Structure 1
Amino acid sequence: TEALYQVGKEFTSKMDLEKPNYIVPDYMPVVYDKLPQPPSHREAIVNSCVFVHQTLHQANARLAKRGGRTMAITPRHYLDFINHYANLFHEKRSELEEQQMHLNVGLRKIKETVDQVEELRRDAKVNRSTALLKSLSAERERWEKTSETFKNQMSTIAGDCLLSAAFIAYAGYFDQQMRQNLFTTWSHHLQQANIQFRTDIARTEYLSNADERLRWQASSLPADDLCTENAIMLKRFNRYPLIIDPSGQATEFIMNEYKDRKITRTSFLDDAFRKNLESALRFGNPLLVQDVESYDPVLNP
């Protein structure tokens, strides 16, 4: 627990996870017995980040208990989770700041247009300027409230990214039911720690714009919640992905998506696999390798 806590703190130290108004909960659940007390927002966030790893280990152990096929959980999962959390936090904060700045520019231009129509009222066009102003000011007021909402969105970003970052890193092999169970457990633990997060989060919607979903559906993506989440996992991956697709739809989806990049098909069983892999690594074209059940170890580095 201490190693996970320390490797989390020094990777999420560059992030602005500071909240001066963080009300510490009366009774907090702790994985790191030596947490600073009373914990601050950064301390609580890192403790929750370790809760994600601990709960995932417990879930895998439970799946082993009921005879299900388990998958190894290693420190690299935690490093990938923290990297995804950092990239997602930076991306969402950058997007919100860009939107808020654009809305401030819009308010400036609305005030400029109000000045222009006031100049035009100095001059039967003049009477109806009373209507356009009645519209413009209303729009201005609307934009003002929109700006206020953005502030609340800031207060909700951090935990939300956590609940998404873990989802991108850990719960990729699990089925939909256990994915939802893990997400509910993480959300409950975040609620227990007074970390502010959206109540009704949609993972597939928080991590992808509708243009991307439309593009995926244009490709051979079966449109389901699990399939959309998987398609997101094929976009926000730090480590290369392993696609378990008995149907075979996902291979066609990857092929159609990366056709512009001239992706080429290969399999481990193929005799000319190593040379094709050498060419792909040497020149940079993307590659899809099939039949990884007979995984060659040469791909380890």
Structure 2
Amino acid sequence: MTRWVRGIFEALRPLETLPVEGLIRIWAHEALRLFQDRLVEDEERRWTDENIDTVALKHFPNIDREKAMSRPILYSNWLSKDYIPVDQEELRDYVKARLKVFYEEELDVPLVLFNEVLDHVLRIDRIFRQPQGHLLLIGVSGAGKTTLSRFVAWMNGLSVYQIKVHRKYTGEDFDEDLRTVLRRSGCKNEKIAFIMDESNVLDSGFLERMNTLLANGEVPGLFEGDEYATLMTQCKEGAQKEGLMLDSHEELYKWFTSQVIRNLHVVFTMNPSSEGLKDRAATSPALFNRCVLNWFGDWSTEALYQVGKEFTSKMDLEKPNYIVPDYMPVVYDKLPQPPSHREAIVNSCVFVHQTLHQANARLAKRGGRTMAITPRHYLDFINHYANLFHEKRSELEEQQMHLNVGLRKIKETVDQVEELRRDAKVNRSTALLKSLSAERERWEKTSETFKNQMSTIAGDCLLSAAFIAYAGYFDQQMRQNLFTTWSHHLQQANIQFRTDIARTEYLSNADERLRWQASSLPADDLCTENAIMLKRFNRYPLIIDPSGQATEFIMNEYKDRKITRTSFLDDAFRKNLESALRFGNPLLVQDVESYDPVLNPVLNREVRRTGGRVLITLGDQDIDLSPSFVIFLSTRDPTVEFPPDLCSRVTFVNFTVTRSSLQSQCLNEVLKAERPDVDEKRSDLLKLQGEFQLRLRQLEKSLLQALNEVKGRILDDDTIITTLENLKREAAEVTRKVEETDIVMQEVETV
């Protein structure tokens, strides 16, 4: 109530004339910033939103409610001054401009400014623009806590300063770091936005000192001995700078303390956890007394859809022949009707995110082990989508260009042979012309198939990326269920994709699979999918496996790149990280349960690129990051729990055998050991997804290489046609496989 009063007073101070509607508007905004801000779920937020208007109308009749309480309640001083109310759209334009400027100086990584972010920025600014404005942010990892904190700190002149924690982090290092931050804040009179995660909060020793610093405004016992004398030496200089000459030690000490209150804001970025929140309430009341707290958890559907739209701008997603389906499966209510191709794809992506939340909730209800799902998973998924779309479109484009060059060469060769005919040999030439024409129509059919693949590429890439980035912790059955759910949702969207897409082959080639089989890796579908994920990832993978096949597998895969083994328990881990960054060799890490917070900059990919240099901040030292560096995290106990901050930085690769993985393994073993013919037919069905076409492409490349030398010598018997009839026979074989795929598929299903 007193904060309500003070906020109303501060908002009313610069104004001279103000109608009653403006007063009740300020009243409502301040109540929202005090009461609705701390709420957790949506029901309480709606309850507050409706009852504030109810109270306002019940105590203030005969006033217009539209201007008095407008739905986009929002206050700031950025535009003009005097804390005047600002419209949402003009504020959005201003924050876009400031974000673009920020992109110029710091954090070039794109951010999307939706309504939630627009509100949180103003809340953070309002708390910062206040003496002793310590603040606590609560939200799931990747929701934009630290990012928005640093953005607002930069915008306000606050020099962001965050401590970094690692293992064996003694209290003396922490005390030195507080000494440094207080010296920078008070003695030198620069405002500091002091920021941290939950990782360095877990130790209870630091919480006492922070409790004193937050409540009193200054921690006794941190400054003593010669350090206190030095502190006094620059405290006198600071007093001289402000023209506040003082000589007694205690008055200067109070002046330094007051400088600390006026020029130090502490920000706590922390993961929602009811039991942990209760524990930290028990051990530190100042986190709830002095530190006003902000809630923002999972991104709303509108935030996800806006992120999807913004991050799929370079991607083509423009099908002029896209037929809008009746009864569109929609999860975003404000979807344009009729939606375009890009709108439908982004809606499907939001559906994938929401349905995986649903699957996680269902699995938790079943009593199984679940891992927290964060918006960083959505960002990683959209990155996989962009990368896969670009890569597949490129591969198809060079394949089509190769086909066109081959067709032009074939036409030139046909013209040359016609000119030669113009001059038994004639029969051979006529047969050559017939075969060349036949293979020409065959390549026209190949162009038709290429166009069909170009049609299906969008759905194929979406399913592939959704599997790689999202799934991986779940067993084989849950992965298959999620893939089917996505497939049915997209077929309800009339989006084009292969109905019998194979995830293992569409995401790799024959050579990589044989290379994996050369290393220690069983021929299991789960193992193949996990190796697929290990091949392609944006966030460094975390490996869970009870038998240890993955560790030796990724050793054998990266032996040529001098991969090294080191665990968290070993004290040489930090030195091995230094060596890996300096040289660039891969480094597998075991025993991930006893996580070391030193890897957070590595996992977060906090790279500083300036002046032809790339830097990574481990400890208080900057290290040149080698371009070819990669790290793998591994463990051995499946029944372990991970902090969601870790879960939001690594992609899970699960090797644990379940009631569905072993069932499939035994079924495949029986098929290969009892009904071999069915095994080769199933292999032919599975490898029809490009591998036969890949062999045809390679052999056609060899044929073009041979045919390039066409002058007389190619007519040794006027028939070099052996290579082209060979091509014709494998082409007929693969075509016969294509026509007869359904019958063989049904037979394999029956067996």
- TM-score (normalizing by structure 1): 0.98
CA distance in 2, matches of 1:170, 1:297: 24
> In structure 2, what is the Cα distance between the partners aligned to 1:284 and 1:195?
42
Deviations 1:140-163 (A, max 9, x none): 110111011111111110011000
2:408 pairs with 1:114: no
Give per-residue Cα distances to partners, 1:35-75, cap 9 Å, x unaligned: 11111110000000111110111111111001100011001
Secondary structure in 2 aligned to 1:289?
Answer: strand
Q: Whole-Å Cα distance in 1 between the matches of residues 455 and 312 of structure 2?
A: 17
Provide the rounded CA distance (Å) in 1 between the counterparts of 2:576 and 2:592.
Answer: 15
Q: d(CA) in 2 for partners of 1:117 and 1:42?
A: 49
Task: Give the drift of 1:281.
Answer: 2.1
Q: C-alpha offsets along residues 121-144 of structure 1, whole Å, 9 cap, x if unaligned? A: 112322211111111111111011
Quick check: 1:203 aligned with 2:503?
yes
Q: Distance in 1 between matches of 2:321 and 2:331?
A: 23
Report the Cα distance in structure 1 between the residues aligned to 2:593 and 2:558, rounded to whole angstroms: 23
Shift of 1:168: 0.7
After alignment, is 19-28 or 234-243 more displaced? 19-28
After TM superposition, list the pairs within 5 Å mapping 1:3-82 onto structure 2: 3-82=303-382
Residue range with higher mean Cα deviation, 72-81 or 265-274: 265-274
Structure 2 matches for 1:88-127, cutoff 5 A?
A: 88-127=388-427
Are the aligned partners of 1:261 and 1:285 in contact in 2 as well (CA < 8 Å)? yes
SS in 2 for 1:214: helix
CA displacement, residues 193-239 of structure 1 (integer Å, 9 cap, x when unaligned): 11111100100110001111111111111111110110010111000
SS at match of 1:261: coil
**In structure 2, C-alpha distance between the alignment counterparts of 1:216 and 1:119, rounded to whole Å:** 51
Task: Find the residue that maps to 1:106 and give its secondary structure.
Answer: helix
How far residue 165 of structure 1 moved from its aligned partner, in angstroms, is 0.3
Structure 1: runs of 5+ lacking an equivalent: none
Report the Cα distance in structure 2 between the residues aligned to 1:131 and 1:30, rounded to whole angstroms: 58
Q: C-alpha displacement at 1:282, in angstroms?
A: 2.8
* Most deviating of 36-45 and 267-276: 267-276
In 1: Cα distance, 2:320 partner to 2:447 partner:
21
Match of 1:243 among 543, 560, 568: 543
The Cα shift of 1:97 comes to: 0.7
Note if 1:135 corresponds to 2:427.
no
Distance of 1:40 and 1:13 partners within structure 2: 13
Deviation of 1:275 after TM superposition, in Å, equals 1.2
Q: CA deviation at 1:280?
A: 1.1
Shift of 1:3: 0.6
Q: Secondary structure at the match of 2:535?
A: coil
Tell me if structure 2 keeps the 8 A contact 1:164–1:203. Answer: yes
Higher relative contact order (CA 8 A, sep 6+): 1
Tell me the secondary structure at the aligned position of residue 546 of structure 2. coil
Alpha-carbon distance, 1:181 to partner:
0.1
1:250 offset after TM fit, Å? 0.7
What is the SS of the residue equivalent to 1:288?
A: strand
Q: Does 1:152 align with 2:456?
A: no
Deviations 1:71-116 (A, max 9, x none): 1100110000000000000000000011011001111011111111
- Equivalents in 2 of 1:18, 1:216: separation in Å? 37
**May I ask how many residue pairs the two structures share in their alignment?**
301
Kept after mapping to 2: 8 A contact 1:52/1:186: yes
Structure 1 distance, partners of 2:412, 2:422, is: 16
- Whether the 8 Å CA contact 1:176–1:226 is kept in 2: the answer is yes
Q: Distance in 2 between matches of 1:40 and 1:100?
A: 27
Cα distance in structure 2, aligned partners of 1:159 and 1:225: 22
- Matched residues in 2 for 1:231 and 1:82: separation? 21
1:9 deviates by 0.6
Structure with bigger strand share is: 2
**Counterpart for residue 299 of structure 1:** 599
CA distance in 1, matches of 2:541, 2:428: 61
1:269 alignment partner, SS class: coil
Answer 1 or 2: which has greater helix percent: 1
1:242 to partner: Cα distance: 0.3
Q: Using the TM superposition, give the Cα deviation of residue 283 of structure 1 relative to its aligned residue in structure 2, in angstroms.
A: 2.4
User: Using the alignment, how far apart are the partners of 1:108 and 1:228 within structure 2?
Assistant: 40
For residue 262 of structure 1, give the secondary structure of its aligned residue in structure 2. Answer: coil
User: Secondary structure of the residue that 2:556 maps to in structure 1?
Assistant: helix
1:296 Cα shift? Answer: 1.2
Q: More deviation in 271-280 or 92-101?
A: 271-280
Specify the SS of the correspondent of 1:10: helix
Write the distance in 2 (CA, Å) between the matches of 1:220 and 1:112.
50
Kindly state the Cα deviation for residue 183 of structure 1 after the two structures are TM-superposed. Answer: 0.1
Q: Is the 8 A contact 1:107 1:140 kept in 2?
A: yes
Identity %: 100
**Deviates further, 77-86 or 111-120:** 111-120
The CA distance in 2 between the partners of 1:123 and 1:220, in whole Å, is 63
Aligned counterparts of 1:52 and 1:263: Cα–Cα separation in 2: 36
Matched, 1:226 2:526: yes
SS in 2 for 1:242: strand
Q: CA deviation at 1:172?
A: 1.0
Structure 1 consecutive aligned stretches of length 4 or more whose deviation exceeds 4 Å: none
Q: What's the offset of the Cα at 1:24?
A: 1.0
Which moves more between the two structures, 24-33 or 180-189? 24-33
CA positional deviation for 1:284 = 1.5
Q: Secondary structure at the match of 1:143?
A: helix
Larger Rg: 2
Alignment pair present for 1:279 and 2:597: no
Deviation at 1:19, TM superposition (A): 0.8
How far 1:120 sits from its partner (Å)? 1.5
Contact 1:219/1:257 (CA < 8 Å) preserved in 2? yes
CA distance in 1, matches of 2:550, 2:507: 19
Per mean C-alpha deviation after superposition, the further-off stretch among 116-125 and 167-176 is 116-125
Is the partner of 1:92 in helix, strand or coil?
A: helix
**Any conservation in 2 of the 1:120–1:126 contact (CA below 8 Å)?**
no
